Design an enzyme around this catalytic site. Sequence first.
Site, short mmCIF file in Angstrom:
data_model
loop_
_atom_site.label_atom_id
_atom_site.label_comp_id
_atom_site.label_asym_id
_atom_site.label_seq_id
_atom_site.Cartn_x
_atom_site.Cartn_y
_atom_site.Cartn_z
N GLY A 165 9.18 0.86 -14.64
CA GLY A 165 9.94 -0.40 -14.77
C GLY A 165 9.04 -1.58 -14.62
O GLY A 165 9.20 -2.59 -15.31
N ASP A 166 8.10 -1.46 -13.72
CA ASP A 166 7.13 -2.50 -13.47
C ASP A 166 6.18 -2.64 -14.64
O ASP A 166 5.71 -3.79 -14.96
CB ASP A 166 6.39 -2.29 -12.13
CG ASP A 166 7.34 -2.33 -10.95
OD1 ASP A 166 8.44 -2.94 -11.09
OD2 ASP A 166 7.05 -1.70 -9.94
N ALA B 92 2.76 -6.97 -7.71
CA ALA B 92 1.38 -6.61 -8.04
C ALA B 92 1.40 -5.66 -9.23
O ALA B 92 0.60 -5.82 -10.16
CB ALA B 92 0.72 -5.96 -6.84
N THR C 72 0.82 -1.19 0.00
CA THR C 72 0.00 0.00 0.00
C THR C 72 0.86 1.26 0.00
O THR C 72 1.71 1.46 0.86
CB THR C 72 -0.93 -0.02 1.15
OG1 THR C 72 -1.66 -1.22 1.18
CG2 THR C 72 -1.99 1.14 1.03
N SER D 287 2.79 4.61 -19.74
CA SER D 287 2.60 4.79 -18.30
C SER D 287 3.25 6.07 -17.78
O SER D 287 2.74 6.69 -16.85
CB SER D 287 3.06 3.57 -17.52
OG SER D 287 4.46 3.63 -17.37
N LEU E 236 16.88 1.68 -19.30
CA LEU E 236 17.64 2.91 -19.34
C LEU E 236 16.82 4.21 -19.34
O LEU E 236 17.18 5.15 -20.00
CB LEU E 236 18.48 2.91 -20.60
CG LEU E 236 19.39 1.72 -20.86
CD1 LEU E 236 20.02 1.87 -22.22
CD2 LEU E 236 20.46 1.65 -19.77
N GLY E 237 15.75 4.25 -18.53
CA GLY E 237 14.82 5.40 -18.49
C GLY E 237 14.39 5.81 -19.88
O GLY E 237 14.03 4.97 -20.73
N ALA F 217 1.13 9.67 -17.46
CA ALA F 217 0.08 9.88 -16.48
C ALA F 217 0.61 9.52 -15.03
O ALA F 217 1.62 8.86 -14.88
CB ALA F 217 -1.13 9.01 -16.84
N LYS G 241 6.16 -4.13 -6.32
CA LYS G 241 6.63 -4.51 -7.64
C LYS G 241 5.91 -5.71 -8.22
O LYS G 241 5.55 -5.73 -9.44
CB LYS G 241 8.14 -4.75 -7.65
CG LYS G 241 8.97 -3.51 -7.36
CD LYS G 241 10.44 -3.90 -7.05
CE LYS G 241 11.24 -2.75 -6.51
NZ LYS G 241 11.38 -1.82 -7.65
N1 LIG Z 1 11.17 9.40 -19.77
C1 LIG Z 1 10.82 8.25 -20.34
N2 LIG Z 1 10.38 8.17 -21.61
C2 LIG Z 1 10.05 7.02 -22.20
N3 LIG Z 1 10.11 5.84 -21.54
C3 LIG Z 1 10.54 5.77 -20.26
C4 LIG Z 1 10.95 6.99 -19.56
N4 LIG Z 1 11.31 6.64 -18.32
C5 LIG Z 1 11.14 5.29 -18.24
N5 LIG Z 1 10.68 4.77 -19.41
C6 LIG Z 1 10.37 3.36 -19.80
O1 LIG Z 1 10.27 2.47 -18.68
C7 LIG Z 1 11.44 1.64 -18.61
C8 LIG Z 1 11.93 1.61 -17.16
O2 LIG Z 1 12.77 2.72 -16.86
P1 LIG Z 1 13.79 2.71 -15.62
O3 LIG Z 1 12.93 3.22 -14.50
O4 LIG Z 1 14.99 3.52 -16.03
O5 LIG Z 1 14.16 1.24 -15.49
C9 LIG Z 1 12.42 2.13 -19.69
O6 LIG Z 1 13.09 1.03 -20.31
C10 LIG Z 1 11.47 2.77 -20.67
O7 LIG Z 1 10.90 1.76 -21.49
NA NA Z 2 12.37 -1.56 -11.68
NA NA Z 3 3.15 7.07 -14.63
#
Ligand SMILES: Nc1ncnc2c1ncn2[C@@H]1O[C@H](COP(=O)(O)O)[C@@H](O)[C@H]1O
Ligand code: NA
Ligand code: NA
EC number: 2.7.1.15
Lengths: 312, 313
Positions: free
Chosen positions: B256-257, B44, B14, B289, B224-225, B292, B42
């Site tokens: 990531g989830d 859920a 929660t 995701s 990689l974000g 939002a 993570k």
């Molecule tokens: N700013 C962003 N723009 C697009 N995709 C993102 C972004 N941040 C995270 N993601 C997506 O979510 C995954 C997880 O990001 P991370 O939290 O760095 O492991 C990445 O591989 C992307 O597919």
């Molecule tokens: Na993660």
């Molecule tokens: Na989000």
Amino acid sequence: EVAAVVVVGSCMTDLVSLTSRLPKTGETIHGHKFFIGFGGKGANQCVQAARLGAMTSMVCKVGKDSFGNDYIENLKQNDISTEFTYQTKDAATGTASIIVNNEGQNIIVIVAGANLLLNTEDLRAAANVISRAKVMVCQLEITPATSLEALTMARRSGVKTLFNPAPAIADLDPQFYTLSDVFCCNESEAEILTGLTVGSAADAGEAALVLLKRGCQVVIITLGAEGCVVLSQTEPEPKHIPTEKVKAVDTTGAGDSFVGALAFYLAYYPNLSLEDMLNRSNFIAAVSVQAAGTQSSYPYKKDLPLTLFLEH
Amino acid sequence: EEVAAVVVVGSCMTDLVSLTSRLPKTGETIHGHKFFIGFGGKGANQCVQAARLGAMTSMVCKVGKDSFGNDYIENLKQNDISTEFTYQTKDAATGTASIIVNNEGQNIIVIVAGANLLLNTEDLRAAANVISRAKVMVCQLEITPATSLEALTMARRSGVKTLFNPAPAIADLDPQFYTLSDVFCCNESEAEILTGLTVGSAADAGEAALVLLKRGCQVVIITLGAEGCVVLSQTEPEPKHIPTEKVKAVDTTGAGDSFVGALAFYLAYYPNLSLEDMLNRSNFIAAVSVQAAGTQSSYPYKKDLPLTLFLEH
Ligand SMILES: Nc1ncnc2c1ncn2[C@@H]1O[C@H](COP(=O)(O)O)[C@@H](O)[C@H]1O
Ligand code: NA
Ligand code: NA
Ligand SMILES: Nc1ncnc2c1ncn2[C@@H]1O[C@H](COP(=O)(O)O)[C@@H](O)[C@H]1O
Ligand SMILES: [Cl-]
Ligand code: NA
Ligand code: NA
């Protein structure tokens, strides 16, 4: 049964996490314990009075959310009427998120939430209960204007008003004082309210007098372990009421135990002297101080000496 | 009726989120301006994403016999997740994550694992028939390491593909976590913790990924974000960078989830897509995701996504 004590004020859910250290900005830390606790000064006051045997009614506003449903069940479980415990979709139930480390240092984040949405219309719908009470108890964890209206509705039906300006506010509206039959606060609240220093029972009598001059009938300042000090319009000389030393375990919510007990006496033992009421109240609060967990430390009548419930 | 193709053995928590103007200093009481409760953990989160894409899922986890836990079960059911092995216990509270966020989106987070630590070997054993029929098992590190290790072994021994997400990461993770992982997926900071290296580039990540691959994972993916992700496999050990479109991120929490739950979905339902393909689709879904707020609330449903994400080889 008609409620003798009506409390218009706050419910708040304590969400407490224990950790080895407090987190730094950006940090996630793993704690080792979580627990939930029922708080809010209104509800705490109401619970103590109820446990001593008062028929009470809690007028307040929580969320239409699990916390709010669970709060309602805690009130019911304490035999408090929840007829005018309102639930709203517009805000969550009030919360206090508390993180405590191994050294006892903490961070607290309060979100008053639904308590701030309790309003004049809500109180008007409760006019029956408010009018037929003997004592109305208010604090400052809801909108000040709402507390002020509650006090006014009480005065216009001849109901005795017990006001606890906690947490204190430096520019408190002058009407709070004139609407307060009994005005009860602690040392640090008195300092905020009067601008003075209160490092003694004597200093407190002086702050109490200022407060009394603003138009309270009766002023009581609580002094932790030192008991309390009282003044009235009819007897303006500060009278110190000590309390015998006990081994304090957790003083959290002691002030609310005190106030709730006072509410109980004002409503049910009107012919005790004020000095007598404040001894019994000091005693009950001092009991709460010897166990942990705020509402869970508030004694029931059956666990207290029968002497607290007789005349003499 | 339908067999669960994705089984997730892992955590429910929660989320207790307070928004404030500034983060509190030691000893400080502050007033915030908004509180929200949310459904996290993570496990859920991964499960919810897969379910929303259309997977039949089964969530194996333990929550409290308390309001949080009853509410969590209702969340899972509302997302069409089987809760046959969502256990409730009197002995601990539902796991919690107590989060304070300031106006700039900086935060402090205090996690209390609670009931998630009591998910035990008897609880898993009861799930053997479900595990045996699943196509993918998904584990993380928010329950006991030993419980996750046993879930991975129970998957292997039934021939069920294992998707392991070592999050939160820990230095000197048991060597078996690597050898039991058909697909091993983590982020840049997890990779640093795991390998002792620095990952400030997609190139640096490929090098960390190679270490991790050498420890015995079949496939290694590092997220990689905004850069998307990097992939290696035993059959194809050269790091391949998969970028992802600049979008305006609104709240990346749980991205990531979303990514892992999508990958789980593809592995289970589109086993003949190439891995490169699966990771484009996954990247895309996670990117949605990020546009939002609110973690699980931001995870898209199949009906709101381009139909191209659901086509075959
Ligand atoms: N700013 C962003 N723009 C697009 N995709 C993102 C972004 N941040 C995270 N993601 C997506 O979510 C995954 C997880 O990001 P991370 O939290 O760095 O492991 C990445 O591989 C992307 O597919
Ligand atoms: Na993660
Ligand atoms: Na989000
Ligand atoms: N350390 C203590 N020992 C005994 N009684 C206490 C103690 N602290 C508080 N009390 C009682 O509870 C009330 C709470 O007072 P305060 O500490 O001003 O909130 C006091 O007026 C006493 O009646
Ligand atoms: Cl630590
Ligand atoms: Na107080
Ligand atoms: Na106590």
